[PDB]
Amino acid sequence: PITGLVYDQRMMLHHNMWDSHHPELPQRISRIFSRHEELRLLSRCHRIPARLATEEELALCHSSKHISIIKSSEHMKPRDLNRLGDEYNSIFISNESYTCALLAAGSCFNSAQAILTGQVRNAVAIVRPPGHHAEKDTACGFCFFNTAALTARYAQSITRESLRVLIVDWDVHHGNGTQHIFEEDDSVLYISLHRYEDGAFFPNSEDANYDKVGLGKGRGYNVNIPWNGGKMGDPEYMAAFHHLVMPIAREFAPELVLVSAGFDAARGDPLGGFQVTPEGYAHLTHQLMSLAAGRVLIILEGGYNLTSISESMSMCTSMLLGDSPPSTPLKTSATVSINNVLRAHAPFWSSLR
Ligand SMILES: CC(C)N(Cc1ccc(C(=O)NO)cc1)S(=O)(=O)c1cc(F)c(F)c(F)c1F
Ligand SMILES: [K+]
Ligand SMILES: [K+]
Ligand SMILES: [Zn+2]
């Protein structure tokens, strides 16, 4: 009945040479770690060591070319780091970026290992850079390799290839890379909540809309819950979990739950525009703990208000440790969104009928 925690300050070395105020700050992870200490959560966890992902583990989800190109940045001069970064959508690169992305992924592998070997029940991974925009063949949106996707495949690689993994992605952005990597896969259920605004919200693709339900054997195993019409918060997220995430997840009956846990839907986030509270994130975590015999790994993705993400992710760890959850009409467009997803997925999930 133990909660694992992974954090390594080396992941702070990834930085933006040209704009030291870029919102994907090194101190994102140290602020979260400090708040865990400050709230006396750290001493209640089992510390799991960070490690580098291997290049063969990266090949679970990424092409050898993508791996080689990102690895080549390790010794690039600033001019070439700027040029390579600019070939992607919203990427900055320093000489330490590749190392840090390996550390983020390997830390989560070690956390998934600790859960699956029974050394801990659940775990939290305070990692950067994030992962969920990363595609098989390209970097995107502050992400180099798809940490959560890789962790799902790593978990399958040490148990069975068809181990049922649920990925709940509550970062305010669509995890396009995660969706694409698993789009034909019935072993990995991807559920994303994200601001959409009819394609105007980053990453600006109709791939994030509710009618993208998966392909082939994966049809039904991709659930997009897209928000339109401005600011959402706890009522909308609790409703989406009650009508959609939890009924589908229970029917899927995952053997492992990964949370792509960006905290940029948080109150105070400058990039998400939403108002999910730390208590709200606590309740979302508490709900997910009812799945997979409690085998839940929470993985930091985005989230840019340092105070918001520190309080929100700490509230999640508090829930993993077994603490009692803390203590409103939906916006009309949120009801429309939830009903659109319900109609899209009732063909595949009996719990929605
Ligand atoms: C496009 C916009 C949404 N951004 C990129 C982004 C990507 C991923 C996440 C995330 O959290 N994904 O899960 C959050 C933000 S930006 O930060 O505001 C931004 C930063 C810059 F440095 C720029 F030069 C620039 F033009 C710019 F738009
Ligand atoms: K998401
Ligand atoms: K899928
Ligand atoms: Zn995000």
Residue numbers in the entry: 442 to 768, 773 to 798
Excerpt from the publication:
Histone deacetylase (HDAC) enzymes catalyze the deacetylation of histone and non-histone proteins. Out of the family of 11 HDAC isozymes, HDAC6 has emerged as a highly attractive and safe target in drug discovery, because of its imperative roles in cellular function and survival, and well-tolerated loss of function when inhibited. The cytoplasmic clients of HDAC6 include an extensive substrate repertoire such as α-tubulin, cortactin, HSP90, tau and peroxiredoxins. HDAC inhibitors typically consist of a cap group which interacts with the surface of the enzyme, a zinc binding group (ZBG) that interacts with the zinc ion in the catalytic pocket, and a linker between these two moieties.
The X-ray crystal structure of the HDAC6–NN-390 complex, which was solved at 1.6 Å resolution, displays a similar profile of contacts in the catalytic tunnel when compared to that of HDAC6-ricolinostat complex. Unlike that of the HDAC6-TO-317 complex, the hydroxamate moiety coordinates to the catalytic Zn2+ ion in a bidentate fashion. The hydroxamate N-O group coordinates to Zn2+ with an average separation of 2.2 Å and the hydroxamate C=O group with a distance of 2.34 Å. Alongside these contacts, interaction of NN-390 completes the canonical 5-membered chelate complex via a hydrogen bond network. The chelate complex involves the side chains Y745 (O—O distance = 2.44 Å), H574 (N—N distance = 2.62 Å), and H573 (N—O distance = 2.47 Å), the latter of which is unobserved for TO-317. The hydroxamate moiety of NN-390 is further able to engage in hydrophobic interactions with D612, D705, and H614, similar to that of ricolinostat. The H614 side chain makes Van der Waals contacts with the benzyl group of the phenylhydroxamate moiety and the isopropyl side group in NN-390, the latter of which is mediated via a water molecule. The benzyl group is sandwiched between F583 and F643 and establishes π-π stacking interactions. The F583 side chain alongside L712 chain also engages in Van der Waals contacts with one of the oxygen atoms of the sulfonamide moiety. Although relatively weakly resolved, and likely more dynamic, the tetra-fluorobenzene (TFB) capping group is observed to make weak interactions with the side chain of H463 and that of S531 and F583 via distinct water molecules.
